[PDB]
């Protein structure tokens, strides 16, 4: 019903740098979507600084307790690094000693995990986006092999869409993960927040097409 | 003859977190070394923040002009990200729009480069360490394939050691790269700086063993 400042600022910048675009788009499904999102267009030092901030404040506000931030290769690698830093920078004394880690796709001269031993540490997984859960599934396999404990996940944008329109539980991608693994899936923003930001920027008519999109596909 | 503050602070932290250790060590060569360095022990949010700062101030002080900061997979990936951010944070208006990029080891569903097109951009390569030049060589191949122009490189620690004791030009690893490619190889610190930091922390005797190490192997 209201957006935190960090969430306004994130959405303002995503639209400005064209990471978030509005129009008529199709997913793999073939499903219509009224926007497109590509976190990769946060691609300058300024925009990465702001992104790091936005993830960090989301994590700080969740009150989740964790020891390590893990990013799945490849796109999670820089995000885990920049967020680990910004948490120490703005989070106070409880985030000074957070570690980061990530996986190589393949070992070498050994190691799949780059970082300190995950054994007995509480892990937050950070990525850009979640759809079928395949990066999450791979991270759990890797982590649980190393005796780490995953306590949560965070993505940039939660689409808050039902994975299937036939499915009568009406579970989104993040919900599905959260149920299977028993952990929170946090996000900087969700579809409801995009909708709220748009109030007073778009026409009555346009407002009614987006607040019907969510009737057909919105989760739970 | 004097250390910048950022260089003192970096060396203080490297010793405190055990990234820099003093004692008797052997390289691959079989060559004795009076220290060991592992940048990977900068592994918490606090320490990564400080590392990012130290690279950024080194880059700002060099006055090198560049458009993109490139990190070779894997260890350069987080360093390029965290440094790109910190440059926007502390560098003022000329570092706001710096981009970062890095390579995948192998393509997929295409792309070796993750980031905006390198064509016609001036690239600074960032890595942890340089020895034989093999990561640098690979980055040049990748970059020049993408029509980018490398303008420089930066590593954490320049060992300032001759690659070979028989070699009568007396070129270090960084010098060798710099000659072959015609670009600066910057570093946060070099061996001479470590020596200077140690003045008044170590005994007269110990000072004389390190200021003889550099007589046998110190470059140029
Ligand atoms: O991170 P990449 O580009 O190396 N690899 P890719 O598998 O394309 O990663 C994307 O898909 C994942 C989401 O997987 P899924 O949730 O769609 O199955 C995220 O990790 C995102 O980076
Ligand atoms: O970065 P990694 O661990 O994926 N791969 P590796 O080839 O071990 O990288 C180290 O060697 C390079 C230095 O290569 P060379 O200068 O010793 O030949 C640096 O990129 C450092 O990260
Ligand atoms: Mg990914
Ligand atoms: Mg490397």
Commentary on this structure:
The structure is a homodimer of 220-residue chains. Chain A is an alpha/beta fold and 220 residues long. Helices cover 40% and strands 20% of the residues of chain A. In chain A, the strands form 2 sheets. Chain A has a 6-stranded mixed sheet with strand order 5-4-3-6-7-8, with helices on both faces. Chain A has a two-stranded antiparallel sheet with strand order 1-2. In chain A, helix 1 (5-16) packs antiparallel against helix 2 and helix 2 (45-62) packs across helix 3 (76-90). The longest helix of chain A has 18 residues, at 45-62. Chain A is globular. The interface between A and B is large, with 37 and 37 residues. Chains A, B: It catalyses: orotidine 5'-phosphate + diphosphate = orotate + 5-phospho-alpha-D-ribose 1-diphosphate. Chains A, B: Its EC number is 2.4.2.10.
Chain oligomer state? homodimer
CATH class of chain A: Alpha Beta
Distance between the termini of chain A: 17 Å
Q: How large, in whole angstroms, is the Cα Rg of chain A?
A: 18 Å
PDB class: transferase
Keywords: transferase
Assembly: dimeric
Entry title: Crystal structure of Saccharomyces cerevisiae OMP synthase in complex with PRP(NH)P
Task: Provide keyphrases for this structure.
six-stranded mixed β-sheet; 8 strands; Rossmann fold; homodimer; binds magnesium ion; binds the ligand O=P(O)(O)NP(=O)(O)O[C@H]1O[C@H](COP(=O)(O)O)[C@@H](O)[C@H]1O; two-stranded antiparallel ribbon; 220 residues; alpha/beta
């Amino acid at each position: 019903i209201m957006l935190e400042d960090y969430q306004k600022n994130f959405l303002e910048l995503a639209i400005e740098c064209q990471a978030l675009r509005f129009g008529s788009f199709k997913l793999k499904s073939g499903r219509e979507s009224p926007y497109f999102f590509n976190l990769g267009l946060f691609n300058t030092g300024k925009l990465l600084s702001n992104l790091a901030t936005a993830y960090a404040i989301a994590i700080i506000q969740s009150d989740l307790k964790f020891d390590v931030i893990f990013g799945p290769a490849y796109k999670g690698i820089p995000l885990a690094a920049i967020v680990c830093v910004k948490l120490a920078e703005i989070g106070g004394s409880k985030f000074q000693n957070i570690q980061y880690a990530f996986n190589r796709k393949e070992a070498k001269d050994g190691g799949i995990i780059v970082g300190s031993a995950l054994e007995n540490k509480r892990i937050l997984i950070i990525d850009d986006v979640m759809t079928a859960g395949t990066a999450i599934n791979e991270a759990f396999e890797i982590i649980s092999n190393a005796k780490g404990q995953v306590v949560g996940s965070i993505i940039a944008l939660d689409r808050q869409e039902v994975v299937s329109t036939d499915d009568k539980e009406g579970l989104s991608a993040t919900q599905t993960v959260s149920k299977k693994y028993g952990i929170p899936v946090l996000s900087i923003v969700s579809l409801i927040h995009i909708i709220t930001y748009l109030e007073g920027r778009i026409t009555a008519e346009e407002k009614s097409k987006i607040e019907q999109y969510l009737q057909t596909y919105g989760a739970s």
